[PDB]
């Protein structure tokens, strides 16, 4: 069920980095990680919370489909991609916080709390500001717990409609070619220590699917590219991608 492979530490070492990668082989039902303790510690989800928050908003009508437009409110913010109109697709891709804060207001916390207990998401706790608990409130989740939630979403087993789950999976699309497909979501948590980055999702092959969840220390914005680079080094060492 779970094996530790400390050879993968070489990939964090050679980049002067600390973190964890967790993998799950769905055909064989086997899990793998470089550090079993950190794999099972809880952190703020940050922008990886955009997956469940999308699901809830669609199932309630706040978002009607993936073409509906959320136009720029005219307030200039330090991230430049955020100062333009978006839909569900581009708002996931550029991690556009103020679009999703507006959703959370619309949903309100009786219904947000209800959906998270139904989802069995993390510690299920939404203490703090209705529109920022995932960035500086009481909600926490581990890498192994990210994997269990994502497996339900892959199999359409969450207690929302099939249509909602299909639309969110479309909007998670990150990479594809003749060898693999990746559906995933980035996160960057900087408001409460420790600053960390996330990348969670899966790799679809012709005949199997490998779920993944990673996080790593991130004192400076300069190492954000390492989230994907280290993850792909593990995948290649294990012969999952070329
Ligand atoms: O890593 C994030 O997703 C991300 C980034 C960087 N980034 C966006 C797309 C790829 N990288 C910047 C700000 C931010 C972010 O997520 B959240 O946790 C909210 O704020």
Automatic annotation (TrEMBL):
Domain of life: Bacteria
A GO term, aspect molecular function: penicillin binding
Domain Penicillin-binding protein transpeptidase: 25-236
Catalytic activity line of the entry: a beta-lactam + H2O = a substituted beta-amino acid
UniProt KW keywords: Antibiotic resistance, Hydrolase, Plasmid, Signal
GO cellular component: plasma membrane
PROSITE patterns: BETA_LACTAMASE_D
Residues at the catalytic site: 47
InterPro entries: Beta-lactam/transpept (IPR050515), Beta-lactam/transpept-like (IPR012338), Beta-lactam_class-D_AS (IPR002137), OXA-48-like (IPR058218), PCN-bd_Tpept (IPR001460)
UniProt-listed SUPFAM superfamilies: beta-lactamase/transpeptidase-like
GO biological process: antibiotic catabolic process; cell wall organization; response to antibiotic
Signal peptide: none
E.C. number: 3.5.2.6
Modified residues (N6-carboxylysine): 50
A Pfam short name: Transpeptidase
Family: Belongs to the class-D beta-lactamase family.
Name the UniProt record assigns to this protein: Beta-lactamase
The species this protein was found in: Klebsiella pneumoniae
Upper lineage: Bacteria, Pseudomonadati, Pseudomonadota, Gammaproteobacteria, Enterobacterales
């Amino acid at each position: 069920e779970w094996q530790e492979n400390k050879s993968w530490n070489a990939h964090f070492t050679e980049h002067k980095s600390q973190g964890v990668v967790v993998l799950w082989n769905e055909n064989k039902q086997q899990g793998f990680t470089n550090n079993l303790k950190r794999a099972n510690q809880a952190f703020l989800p940050a922008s990886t919370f955009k997956i469940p928050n999308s699901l809830i908003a669609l199932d309630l009508g706040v978002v009607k489909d993936e073409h509906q437009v959320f136009k720029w409110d005219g307030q200039t913010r330090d991230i430049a991609t955020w100062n333009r109109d978006h839909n569900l697709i581009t708002a996931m891709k550029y991690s556009v916080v103020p679009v999703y804060q507006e959703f959370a207001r619309q949903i309100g916390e009786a219904r947000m709390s209800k959906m998270l207990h139904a989802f069995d998401y993390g510690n299920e706790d939404i203490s703090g500001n209705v529109d920022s608990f995932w960035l500086d409130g009481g909600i926490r989740i581990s890498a192994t717990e990210q994997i269990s939630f994502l497996r339900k979403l892959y199999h359409n087993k969450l207690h929302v409609s099939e249509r909602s789950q299909r639309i969110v999976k479309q909007a998670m699309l990150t990479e594809a070619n003749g060898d693999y497909i990746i559906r995933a979501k980035t996160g960057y948590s900087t408001r409460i220590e420790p600053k960390i980055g996330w990348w969670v999702g899966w790799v679809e092959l012709d005949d199997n699917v490998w779920f993944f969840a990673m996080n790593m220390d991130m004192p400076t914005s300069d190492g954000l590219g390492l989230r994907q680079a280290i993850t792909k080094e593990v995948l290649k060492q294990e012969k999952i991608i070329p």
